[PDB]
Design a protein around this ligand. Structure first.
Ligand SMILES: [Cu+2]
Length: 235
């Protein structure tokens, strides 16, 4: 159970974005139904009044929280991967539009899941803003908690992979468009009951064998991190 509080741009806090530049849902409960319209941008997908200005090459940091800012972030039980997708905002996230900018699942070197490292990072993970066409975008941050993912939600709706989905309104101003954004995948639709990484038993199957759900990270993506960029406590 986790939500996005706001974003940082080049280590500068853009301030509380809830219902302002984040299409915030009414609470931190997960989406679990893979065919739900809620898979796009969670249960309250609508245009919110602000879009955060960035340029291509900026570091964009999402900041998550559980109940209050810079708390426990997400229950430690919620091991799983983190992904970030981008879509042109005029799509409203509909159709074959989501392009993957970031994936971090289980780190063999560190013996840690992305969620474990997200807690250590005070809820912060980042991407480099890609060199796409200037304009308005949705950045869809997705945490998949796998602690109940041994079952499919379609077989036992009390269990299943848990999707914590947050869509940020981002406006890309300066971009040379060296990597024009292609068509992407649909949400709902990209993940199905047979997709690798959706049904996974963390109690019985080693995390070294986990394969995150496709699609692959786009060739135009410039990278990211799971690391604290900014110290909320200094504010
Ligand atoms: Cu939870």
């Amino acid at each position: 159970h986790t939500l996005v509080w706001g974003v940082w741009v080049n280590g500068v806090d853009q301030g509380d974005g809830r219902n302002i530049y984040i299409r915030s849902p009414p609470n931190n409960n997960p989406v679990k139904n893979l065919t739900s319209p809620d898979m796009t941008c969670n249960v309250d997908n609508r245009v919110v009044p602000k879009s955060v200005p960035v340029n291509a090459g900026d570091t964009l940091t999402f900041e998550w929280y559980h109940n209050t800012r810079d708390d426990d972030i997400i229950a430690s039980s919620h091991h799983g991967p983190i992904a970030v997708y981008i879509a042109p905002a005029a799509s409203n996230g509909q159709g074959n539009v989501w392009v993957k900018l970031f994936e971090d699942a289980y780190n063999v070197t560190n013996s840690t899941w992305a969620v474990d490292r997200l807690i250590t990072a005070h809820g912060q993970h980042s991407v480099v803003v890609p060199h796409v066409a200037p304009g308005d975008y949705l950045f869809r941050a997705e945490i998949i908690a796998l602690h109940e993912a041994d079952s499919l939600y379609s077989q036992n709706p009390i269990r299943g992979a848990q999707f914590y989905i947050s869509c940020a309104q981002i406006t890309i101003n300066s971009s040379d468009d060296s990597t024009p954004l292609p068509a992407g995948v649909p949400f709902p639709g990209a993940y199905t009951d047979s997709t690798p990484g959706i049904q996974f038993n963390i109690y019985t199957t080693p995390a070294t064998s986990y394969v995150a759900p496709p699609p692959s990270v786009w060739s135009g993506a410039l990278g990211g991190s799971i690391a604290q960029v900014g110290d909320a406590s200094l504010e």
